[PDB]
Paper text:
Here, we present the structure of the NDH–PSI–LHCI supercomplex from Spinacia oleracea at 3–3.3-Å resolution. The supercomplex consists of 41 protein subunits, 154 chlorophylls and 38 carotenoids. We modeled a total of 46 lipids into distinct densities in the spinach supercomplex map, of which 23 are in the NDH membrane arm and 23 are in PSI–LHCI-2. The peripheral arm of plant NDH binds three iron–sulfur clusters precisely spaced for efficient electron transfer. In addition to the subunits found in cyanobacterial NDH, we discovered a previously unresolved subunit that we identified on the basis of its resolved side-chain sequence as NdhU of the SubE module. NdhU is centrally placed in the SubE module, establishing electrostatic interactions and salt bridges with subunits NdhI, NdhH, NdhK and NdhJ on the stromal side and potentially with NdhA on the lumenal side. In the spinach supercomplex, Lhca6, NdhF and PnsB5 stabilize the connection between NDH and PSI–LHCI-2. The peripheral redox arm of NDH is well resolved and contains a density near the entry of the PQ cavity that fits a bound PQ molecule. The PQ sits at the entrance of the cavity surrounded by several charged residues, interacting with Y259 of NdhA through its carbonyl group. The PQ head group is directed toward the N2 Fe–S cluster at an approximate distance of ~24 Å, too far for direct electron transfer.
The nicotinamide adenine dinucleotide phosphate (NADPH) dehydrogenase (NDH) complex is crucial for photosynthetic cyclic electron flow and respiration, transferring electrons from ferredoxin to plastoquinone while transporting H+ across the chloroplast membrane. In flowering plants, NDH forms a supercomplex with photosystem I, enhancing its stability under high light. In the thylakoid membranes of plants and cyanobacterial chloroplasts, NADPH dehydrogenase (NDH) is homologous to the mitochondrial NADH:ubiquinone (Q) oxidoreductase (complex I). Unlike complex I, NDH lacks an NADH oxidation (N) center and uses ferredoxin (Fd) as the electron donor instead.
Numbering used by the authors:
A (entry chain 0): 77 to 232, 248
B (entry chain B): 20 to 507
C (entry chain G): 1 to 176
D (entry chain E): 1 to 100
E (entry chain 8): 89 to 231
F (entry chain C): 5 to 119
G (entry chain 6): 74 to 198
H (entry chain A): 66 to 265
The structure:
């Protein structure tokens, strides 16, 4: 094969973030989320980002990393019928800003999905970048989606 | 994907999958080949209905399980009822193949409808959900509408189909209105053992909207069981439909509706037992009183058997009323097992008599003993078993039904049952009184020109598997209950 | 995820009035054609109610299937009745209709005395966990497809058998 | 909001359908009133799924199945109507009281 | 307000192990059976009292243990955390008897439940007490 | 919201024929006469009022169409969930399509679809 | 007694005399508590439950704020009214951000509504 | 057309204004309400399908996720209006035209539905924008015309039958019936039943 999958950069200077999504994907309107892109054919394979107001200055103000990540996965990011597990938790830091990227699987009795979620806190906002793929096709695309989750960046508005 | 989760769950409904495969194979052969053969249709219907029981008996020892994501419950209670449905279909196929062939009509369609009604009756026996407690009896009721009007030319069958379709659209929509009321005031739950918890979670277990659901469900089920003023659909349909289909709807409909009533009054409606207990007591007392009183003023045999059925259903209702503690559900079966043989024998004799004779009026049954002593003997034995006469199955079945009623303190119900059983001797004796008339002047020309013919015929075997049962099960009423108290 | 409040309530009242008019036309018209056309108004109003609540797939299914049903009903009412009979026009009133009007009024009063006495908003706040949708299933028709394919498998094939047998019985009974 | 009014309308429909089921002198009209009753039940199911079942959508699926059953009934009759009209050349159901 | 009078003797008291979610629990009897499985139907016996020790609900009133699908949010959050476990609460085992103190935010919240005909079953912001008893996992056949 | 535009468009689409009827009523003249209001029957005076009463064997495809509409409605949610799930829904809907084909074959062979 | 919320909403809306101010203030307090408890449902993006809650609490507040003016003394009755209007405006914005749902804007309007209702309770005392 | 405007450009506008100024003629023998309601129902149910057509990635009035299924559902309603027009006119030609329209719709609703279902299966979504973008993934070779030729031909034939264009103009066949269901219709209603056809 040639050079790997080519990515396009989406930069929102008004909302002060920037990430990177596969160029094959198309923009679309996720319900209530600020930005979203999705694959043109495959389902449950998409990147989305919505932010909530907050008064904290960094993600470290949310408490211990693992505990708040687990409470967010169980309580907020998953429906009550979905069994959740976290397979990888990482922290990265650039320009004094920290991003918490964790990979989790939601296994409903009907269907199973896998997500890379990156949390950040800056500009008085709490960002929840999410990359999603179906579990059946997760192993093929995981690296090809991790580059998305490692590409999340938040700057000053 | 895996196709596995459904594959392992698909083996749980393998006896029904055998019926579906036999149905599809019969339909494909009917479509593919122009010529029609009676023996092949006999073979396919039988081997569909004797391989489902073969697979079901192999599944008896297996663990109870809820499959298809809270849609199908397999346990000890529903397996017996599914076996009863299969037995009814197996003993009704010989009743149907001769009758529909002698009417010169297509028979593959009749066998298809019977097999589909059996398939929709087996699913109703274990239907652990509210959607499939609606879809499965609509696999039965729609086929019952397609049946009982399959005659298509008699002016009686059209009116019977009109009455059946209109009254069963009146019911099974009140039933679903009750289902909607029960589903709404519960928190969006439809699985049978999950809405009492949902009712407490929403704290609506004493809501006025729960009484509406209970009443509507009881009405929609008492239409199908036909006790009490939900009985008017029965006699006309029983009087203006072909005899094999009405025998099927006499034995198969009551088994499935009894199973649904037991699984809908105990699992999701145990908190309000003091209401549906009263409803069932009224529904049973009125049933025996107004099914045994009108049957003694009947001039037609099928209509008299209709009033007979709506009388005998009230005896079975006592088994639900007493509950599972003082036996109860163990007295529903070991009497429904009796009732199947009683009614199928007393309908097989009617089938043979009508085919060789061409009549339905009771007055034309005079002098059958002189012509065919075997048929008169068999019909008399079936009718005396129907009346609860001592050495025959109905007597021990009724004393089993009344022992649990007395043990539960229901003196009024047992007293009404005994009085109505006394009333239920004058008929089942009137027919015999006609059968033993040696007066040649009172003998109708319908039986004067009666040819028994030197061949056995299939119905003779089918009711010889029955008349020897309603008399010789009277010692074997200790083997049956130990299979029916084992369920819980 | 709804219309503005006053608009929603006005649409509820307007579609309810249209539904009442259609049902009254159904139960007061002598001609099966006229009452069928009133039934069509009822069908359209009910589909609009489904669109109002959240059901964008059930409304379309109702429109398609019930529009086919009413078209077939009009065809078979034309074919199985006497002359066109515009003069029939609101069949006459008998005592047998007057008693059943009282019975149905009593039944409707019994239902509405329960509907008006039950706090339906109180049940909603108790079923909180039943209203937390999966975030990946944005499309409501996608959720209905998933829950039709997985949760309800046995009715999904039972309805296929029912439809096949109903087709066969309709062909066999209605053939000349 | 006044969403409960929908329930009221459903009840009304049921009663009206019930009324139209009894005073029917035409079995096609009786079938239409059966459709009316099933439609009222479906309205109850859909509004209850909106109220309490925003995720599982069990009421919507039940509504789809009830529509399927109603169409199956609408296919079985008027085929029964066809047989009746071929044999008797009349539709009025109260006039047929042979079995009584 | 709409409390049905049920006369039942009290259960032995406890010291309540408060958790992060606000639930309090104690192990009156530690079950020796299988722990409460996820997405499974279980039969338990409970005696639900309000504050001031007035009982408003009981599975003994209906005569049989209640069957619920545990672990998937089909009951109040306090009952799910008490039975299924999680967040510092060990799961209950078969035969185990446990006391539970559900705060209002883990129960029905500031909204009364079961409101009809001029009264409600549960008042607003009510702390509930549950003497739950894990009878077992649901089976189609009883002994 | 994605559905208030639907309601506004439906209201406008219903209003348009009302506007056309009102404009025709306020613009076009009325000149009614007893010959003009008679039903058109190619010049000759119409006989008895309309009405045809087709045969049943002609209009027996409608009973097939009622069932087939339900089958095609049921096939849509499976197609919407074909990608999220896998071969399980393929096996599930294969029986649906096979039953549809068998019913079509039955209608073809029995002469229901013959005119 | 419970004084409200014990029957169907349309019956209490159209076939009930109304609430005294001493019960209206309690309904204000209960509405504030429900708004405080709505945060978890707001975070789980359940827009239908939130919109139902907002419409019902709006329909309660339009009567309760109007009928609780008596308990406010004359020296504050104008300013309280201003606060009441502010609360209405905030809830309107919350309405506009639950239908046509947005996450950030609905959260902003939720916090604004909480602050406005806390000011309203401070005025009512 | 050459004289109504420069090159006949104003011919159809002249036809529309003439039909506006033409006397509205109602049948005395038939029913007025069905006569007035029929064409309105047809034009409403045909106009309702324009809500989901995208002329660009976001030049769509409503990108409803139900999509093409709603278009089929609303397009099913117009033959009821045609039957209403046929029955209300109290004319034998109108009755025949209405029955023919109902039969045509019954025959050709199902292949169109299955052809739309196949496209929705290929694009995994019922929304029109999703279908167009799924086509646009692979460009010119990504069009469903090449991947689904059989559905393409069947969709063309079924749409031509539903639009009642020739050779499927049986309910309005001028040589067999005088004008079909439009026989007794005059003035603005015939223009409505003309618009609806061209809009379809
Ligand atoms: C008069 C007829 C019955 C005569 C008296 C019955 C007692 C017969 C022998 C004694 C006994 O215990 O038999 C016991 C019998 C055996 O019947 C059953 O047999 C089963 C064998 O698989 C098991 O042993 C059961 O427990 C036993 O009840 O009980 C009866 O029901 C007697 C009638 C047997 C059927 C005859 C036809
Ligand atoms: C038997 C009943 C029908 C068959 C059920 C499913 C087909 C069995 C193979 C499934 C595998 C699959 O996805 O289809 C393959 C193509 O195989 C076929 O098309 C074979 C079937 C031919 C005809 C069947 C369809 C018509 C009936 C594609 O290969 P893959 O490597 O992408 O998939 C491997 C993995 O198992 C995915 O889950
Ligand atoms: C209780 C059992 C009820 C079902 C069987 C009733 C008795 C049937 C019988 O005696 O056989 C008949 C049926 O025999 C057949 O032809 C079919 C073969 C036997 C079918 C009945 C038994 C099937 C079950 C046997 C065991 C299971 C075999 C399959 C599984 C291994 C005889 O038919 P005939 O050849 O006289 O028919 C002539 C025809 O009417 C002229 O038009
Ligand atoms: C696994 C498939 C098993 C098929 C068993 C069918 C069989 O045994 O063949 C029958 C059918 O064999 C044929 O001769 C027909 C050709 C095959 C038809 C089946 C095709 C579809 C199978 C699914 C026997 O015919 P018969 O002599 O009983 O008469 C039946 C005839 O069609 C009507 O009288
Ligand atoms: C017309 C019916 C008359 C009544 C017949 C009564 C029969 C005599 C009494 C029999 C009592 C002993 C059976 C008690 C339950 C046995 C459960 C069991 O293990 O059944 C096995 C055997 O299956 C049967 O034979 C069950 C049938 C008898 C029970 C139902 C009878 C019909 C219902 C009566 C009403 C399971 O089948 P398998 O092949 O998977 O098991 C292998 C091995 O045998 C055990 O591991
Ligand atoms: C001792 C009680 C004997 C009479 C009761 C009885 O068993 O039933 C019948 C007795 O049954 C017999 O006739 C015997 C043959 C069947 C065997 C039934 C059981 C016999 C007694 C068993 C022990 C008690 C009575 O009616 P019937 O069949 O005699 O009627 C007249 C008949 O039509 C003449 O053919
Ligand atoms: C779109 C809905 C349009 C509004 C329909 C109702 C109009 C207001 C009520 C008037 C009653 C009416 O239309 O009745 C007619 C019947 O109504 C219908 O059939 C129209 C309703 C069908 C709507 C189809 C929707 C799909 C004819 O009966 P009549 O007694 O008014 O007739 C008098 C005389 O004979 C002259 O006609
Ligand atoms: C100012 C509006 C009226 C107007 O523009 O008049 C023209 C249009 O007005 C109408 O006739 C009505 C249509 C409205 C546009 C008529 O002119 P014509 O195009 O028919 O003649 C031009 C030339 O000689 C032939 O092309
Ligand atoms: C007539 C065919 C010409 C092309 C029609 C395009 C569709 C159209 O006119 O509507 C869109 C047109 O979109 C525009 O705004 C373009 C305006 C100029 C159109 C020029 C043609 C609506 O898209 P929107 O996202 O703006 O929809 C409204 C939105 O939800 C806010 O209310
Ligand atoms: C411009 C918008 C404003 C601004 C107002 C709207 C005006 C408007 C557009 C009014 C209605 C116009 C239609 C649109 C008017 C009717 C057009 C049909 C549509 C006219 C029918 C004319 C035939 C009569 C047309 C086709 C036709 C052509 C032909 O050559 C032959 C042989 C036959 C048999 C035909 O039927």
């Amino acid at each position: 094969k040639e050079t790997p999958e080519r990515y396009t950069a989406f930069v929102d200077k008004a909302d002060g973030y920037s990430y990177v999504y596969p160029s094959d994907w198309r923009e679309f309107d996720f319900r209530a989320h600020d930005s979203a892109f999705k694959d043109r054919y495959l389902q449950l394979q998409n990147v989305r980002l919505s932010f909530i107001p907050t008064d904290k200055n960094d993600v470290h103000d949310l408490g211990p990393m693992e505990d708040v990540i687990q409470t967010l996965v169980k309580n907020i990011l998953a429906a009550p019928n979905q069994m959740t597990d976290i397979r990888e938790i990482q922290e990265r830091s650039v320009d004094g800003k920290n991003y918490w990227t964790f990979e989790y699987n939601l296994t409903s009795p009907n269907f199973s999905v896998t997500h890379f979620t990156t949390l950040a806190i800056a500009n008085g906002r709490y960002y929840t970048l999410t990359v999603s793929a179906n579990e059946r096709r997760w192993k093929r695309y995981r690296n090809k989606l991790k580059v998305v989750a490692d590409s999340f960046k938040v700057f000053e508005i | 994907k895996a196709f596995h989760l459904l594959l392992f769950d698909g083996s749980l409904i393998f006896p029904e999958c055998i019926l579906i495969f036999g149905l599809i194979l019969l339909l494909m052969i009917d479509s593919t080949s122009d010529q029609k053969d009676i023996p092949w249709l006999y073979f396919i219907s039988s081997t569909s209905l004797v391989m489902s029981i073969t697979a079901l008996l192999f599944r008896w020892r297996e663990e109870p399980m809820i499959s298809f994501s809270g849609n199908f419950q397999t346990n000890n209670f529903n397996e017996i009822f599914q076996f009863l449905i299969l037995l009814c279909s197996t003993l009704c196929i010989p009743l149907s193949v001769e009758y529909i062939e002698c009417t010169e009509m297509a028979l593959t369609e009749f066998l298809l409808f019977i097999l589909t009604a059996t398939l929709g009756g087996m699913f109703l026996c274990g239907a652990n959900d509210l959607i499939t407690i609606f879809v499965a009896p609509e696999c039965f009721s729609l086929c019952s509408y397609l049946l009982s009007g399959y005659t298509k030319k008699d002016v009686r069958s059209n009116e019977a189909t009109t009455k059946y379709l209109l009254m069963g659209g009146a019911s099974s929509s009140i039933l679903v209105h009750g289902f909607s009321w029960l589903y709404g005031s519960s928190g969006g739950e439809i699985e049978l053992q999950e809405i009492v918890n949902g009712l407490i979670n929403t704290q609506m277990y004493n809501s006025p909207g729960i009484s509406i659901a209970l009443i509507f469900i009881t009405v929609g089920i008492g239409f199908k069981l036909s006790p009490a003023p939900s009985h008017q659909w029965t006699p006309d349909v029983y009087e203006g439909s072909p005899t094999p289909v009405v025998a099927f709807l006499s034995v198969t409909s009551k088994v499935a509706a009894s199973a649904s009533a037991t699984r809908i009054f105990d699992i999701p409606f145990y908190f309000s037992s003091n209401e549906w207990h009263l409803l069932l007591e009224i529904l049973a007392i009125l049933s025996m009183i107004l099914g045994n009183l009108i049957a003694i003023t009947q001039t037609s045999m099928k209509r008299m058997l209709a009033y007979s059925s709506i009388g005998q259903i009230g005896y079975v209702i006592i088994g639900i009323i007493v509950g599972d503690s003082n036996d109860g559900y163990a007295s529903m079966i070991t009497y429904m097992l009796f009732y199947i043989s009683m009614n199928l024998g007393t309908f097989a004799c009617i089938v043979l008599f009508g085919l060789r004779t061409g009549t339905d009026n009771i007055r034309d049954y005079a002098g059958l003993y002189t012509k065919d002593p075997f048929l008169a003997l068999s019909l008399a034995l079936c009718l005396l078993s129907l009346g609860g006469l001592p050495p025959l199955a109905g007597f021990f079945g009724k004393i089993y039904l009344f022992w649990c009623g007395w043990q539960a303190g229901l003196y009024f119900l047992v007293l009404i049952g005994l009085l109505t059983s006394v009333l239920s001797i004058y008929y089942y004796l009137k027919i015999i009184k006609l059968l033993m008339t040696g007066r040649n002047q009172e003998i109708t020309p319908h039986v004067r020109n009666y040819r028994r013919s030197p061949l056995r015929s299939k119905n003779s075997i089918e009711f010889s598997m029955i008349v020897c049962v309603i008399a010789s099960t009277i010692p074997g009423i200790s083997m049956n209950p130990i299979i029916t108290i084992a369920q819980d | 995820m709804d219309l503005p409040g006053p608009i929603h309530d006005f649409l509820l009242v307007f579609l309810g009035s249209g539904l009442i008019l259609g049902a009254l036309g159904v139960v007061l018209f002598t001609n099966p054609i006229f009452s069928a056309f009133s039934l069509g108004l009822v069908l359209v109003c009910i589909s609009l109610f489904y669109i109002l609540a959240n059901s964008h797939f059930v409304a379309s299914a109702q429109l398609l299937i019930y529009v086919g049903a009413i078209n077939v009903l009009i065809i078979f009412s034309v074919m199985f009745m006497s002359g066109p009979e515009y003069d029939k026009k609101f069949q006459l009133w008998t005592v047998g209709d007057g008693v059943t009007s009282l019975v149905c009024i009593s039944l409707f009063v019994s239902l509405i005395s329960t509907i008006l006495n039950t706090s339906w908003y109180g049940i909603i706040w108790t079923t909180k966990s039943n209203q937390i949708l999966e975030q990946d299933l944005i499309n409501a028709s996608q959720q209905i497809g998933i829950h039709l394919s997985t949760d309800f498998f046995l009715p999904f094939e039972l309805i296929s058998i029912i439809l096949l047998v109903s087709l066969i019985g309709a062909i066999a009974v209605a053939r000349q | 909001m006044i969403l409960e009014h929908v329930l009221v309308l459903s009840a009304f429909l049921f009663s009206i359908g019930i009324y139209g089921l009894v005073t029917s002198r035409n079995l096609v009209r009786a079938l239409m009133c059966l459709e009316l009753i099933l439609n009222a039940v479906n309205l109850n199911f859909v509004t209850f799924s909106d109220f309490f079942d925003s995720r599982q959508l069990k009421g919507n699926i039940f509504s789809i199945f009830v529509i399927a059953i109603a169409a199956a009934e609408a296919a079985i009759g008027p085929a029964i109507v066809s047989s009746i009209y071929r044999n008797r050349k009349s539709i009025r159901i109260n006039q047929s009281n042979l079995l009584n | 307000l709409r409390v049905e009078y049920y006369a039942t003797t009290a259960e032995p008291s406890c010291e309540l192990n408060l958790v992060r979610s606000g639930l309090g629990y104690c192990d009156l009897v530690v079950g020796s059976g299988v722990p409460a499985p996820y997405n499974t139907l279980i039969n338990v016996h409970y005696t639900a009292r309000f504050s001031d020790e007035t009982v408003f609900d009981s599975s003994y009133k209906r005569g049989r243990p209640l069957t619920m699908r545990i672990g998937v949010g089909k009951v109040i959050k306090g009952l799910d955390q008490g039975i299924f476990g999680g967040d510092g609460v060990p799961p209950m085992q078969v035969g185990g008897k446990r006391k539970l103190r559900i705060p209002p935010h883990l129960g029905y919240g500031p909204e009364p439940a079961g409101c009809f005909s001029g009264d409600c079953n549960v008042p607003a912001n009510a702390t509930l007490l549950y003497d739950v008893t894990f009878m077992g996992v649901y089976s189609g056949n009883r002994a | 919201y994605e559905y208030d535009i639907f309601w506004a468009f439906l209201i406008i689409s219903s209003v348009i024929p009302i506007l056309a009827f009102l404009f025709s009523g306020i613009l076009a003249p009325i000149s009614k006469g007893p010959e003009k209001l008679s039903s058109y029957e190619s010049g000759i005076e119409p006989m008895g009022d309309a009405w045809l009463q087709f045969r049943i064997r002609y209009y027996m495809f409608a009973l097939v169409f009622v069932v087939f509409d339900v089958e095609t409605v049921f096939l849509y949610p499976w197609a919407m969930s074909f990608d999220i799930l896998g071969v399980s829904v393929f096996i599930e809907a294969l029986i649906f399509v096979l039953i549809l084909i068998v019913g079509l074959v039955y209608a073809w062979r029995k002469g229901a679809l013959e005119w | 007694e419970f004084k409200w919320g014990t029957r169907s909403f349309i019956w209490e809306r159209f076939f009930e005399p109304g609430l005294s101010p001493e019960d209206a203030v309690s309904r204000i307090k209960n509405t504030a508590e429900g708004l405080h408890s709505l945060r978890h449902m707001l975070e789980t993006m359940s827009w239908r439950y939130v919109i139902f809650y907002i419409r019902l609490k709006q329909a309660y507040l339009k009567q309760d704020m109007k009928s609780a003016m008596i308990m406010v003394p004359e020296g504050r009755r104008d300013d309280y009214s201003n606060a009441a209007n502010e609360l209405v405006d905030n809830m309107a914005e919350f309405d506009y951000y639950v239908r046509t749902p947005k996450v950030y804007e609905s959260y902003v309007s939720y916090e604004k509504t909480l602050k406005s209702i806390d000011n309203l309770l401070g005025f009512l005392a | 057309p050459e004289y109504a405007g420069p090159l006949g450009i104003l011919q159809a506008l002249a036809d529309g204004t003439k039909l506006l100024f033409k006397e509205n003629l109602l049948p005395s023998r038939g029913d007025t309400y069905l006569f007035s309601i029929g064409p309105s129902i047809a034009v409403i149910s045909i106009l309702l399908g324009y809500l989901i057509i995208p002329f660009g990635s976001r030049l769509v009035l409503a990108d409803l996720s139900i999509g093409v299924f709603l278009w089929i559902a609303v397009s099913s309603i117009a033959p009821i209006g045609l039957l209403m027009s046929g029955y209300g006119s109290n004319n034998k030609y109108s009755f025949l035209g209405g029955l023919r329209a109902a039969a045509q719709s019954i025959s050709y609703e199902i292949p169109l539905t299955l052809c739309v279902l196949s496209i929705s299966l290929l694009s995994n979504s019922s929304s029109t924008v999703d279908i167009v973008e799924a086509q646009s993934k692979y460009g010119f070779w990504g069009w469903n015309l090449w991947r689904q030729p059989i559905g393409f031909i069947v969709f063309i034939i079924s749409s031509l039958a539903e639009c009642e264009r020739l050779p499927f103009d049986l309910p309005e066949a001028e040589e067999e019936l005088v004008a079909g269901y439009q026989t007794e219709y005059s003035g603005i209603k015939f223009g409505l039943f003309y618009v609806a056809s061209y809009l379809n």
